[PDB]
Amino acid sequence: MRRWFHPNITGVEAENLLLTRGVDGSFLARPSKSNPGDFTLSVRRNGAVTHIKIQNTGDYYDLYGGEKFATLAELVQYYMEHHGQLKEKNGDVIELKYPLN
């Protein structure tokens, strides 16, 4: 739903927040600089932060592949509930565990 969304932050303030007040599995979503309109999930795992690109085609949201969603909040809820399905690049499963509010 809402509190893990941070309109207010840069990629670097996202890594700050997650490394000082996060734990592994902490995540937030934030507007993208790499492509406006889109958003990006900054996820903490193994002490580091990964940034995953969320596509907004204006017709649905996805992770440039995968299941399609009408809303951002629905995308994040599916991946919180469905633990094996978010994988970045090298098939590496990433757990969306603890929202960084």
Curated annotation (Swiss-Prot):
Disruption phenotype: Conditional deletion in limb and head mesenchyme leads to increased cartilage mass and deficient ossification: osteochondroprogenitors become chondrocytes and not osteoblasts caused by inability of PTPN11/SHP2 to mediate tyrosine dephosphorylation of SOX9. Phosphorylated upon activation of the receptor-type kinase FLT3. Phosphorylated by activated PDGFRB. Phosphorylated upon activation of the receptor-type kinase PDGFRA. Highly expressed in brain, heart and kidney. The modification Phosphotyrosine is found at residues 60, 64. It comes from the Eukaryota. It is found in: Cytoplasm. Residues 4-100 form the SH2 domain. Acts downstream of various receptor and cytoplasmic protein tyrosine kinases to participate in the signal transduction from the cell surface to the nucleus. Positively regulates MAPK signal transduction pathway. Dephosphorylates GAB1, ARHGAP35 and EGFR. Dephosphorylates ROCK2 at 'Tyr-722' resulting in stimulation of its RhoA binding activity. Dephosphorylates CDC73. Dephosphorylates SOX9 on tyrosine residues, leading to inactivate SOX9 and promote ossification. Dephosphorylates tyrosine-phosphorylated NEDD9/CAS-L. The SH2 domains repress phosphatase activity. Binding of these domains to phosphotyrosine-containing proteins relieves this auto-inhibition, possibly by inducing a conformational change in the enzyme. Belongs to the protein-tyrosine phosphatase family. Non-receptor class 2 subfamily. Interacts with CD84 and with phosphorylated SIT1 and MZPL1. Interacts with FCRL4, FCRL6 and ANKHD1. Interacts with GAREM1 (tyrosine phosphorylated); the interaction increases MAPK/ERK activity and does not affect the GRB2/SOS complex formation. Interacts with PTPNS1 and BCAR3. Interacts with phosphorylated LIME1. Interacts with SHB and INPP5D/SHIP1. Interacts with KIR2DL1; the interaction is enhanced by ARRB2. Interacts with GAB2. Interacts with TERT; the interaction retains TERT in the nucleus. Interacts with PECAM1 and FER. This is Tyrosine-protein phosphatase non-receptor type 11. It comes from Mus musculus (Mouse). The lineage of its organism: Eukaryota, Metazoa, Chordata, Craniata, Vertebrata. The gene is Ptpn11. The chain holds residues 4 to 103 of 593 of the full protein.
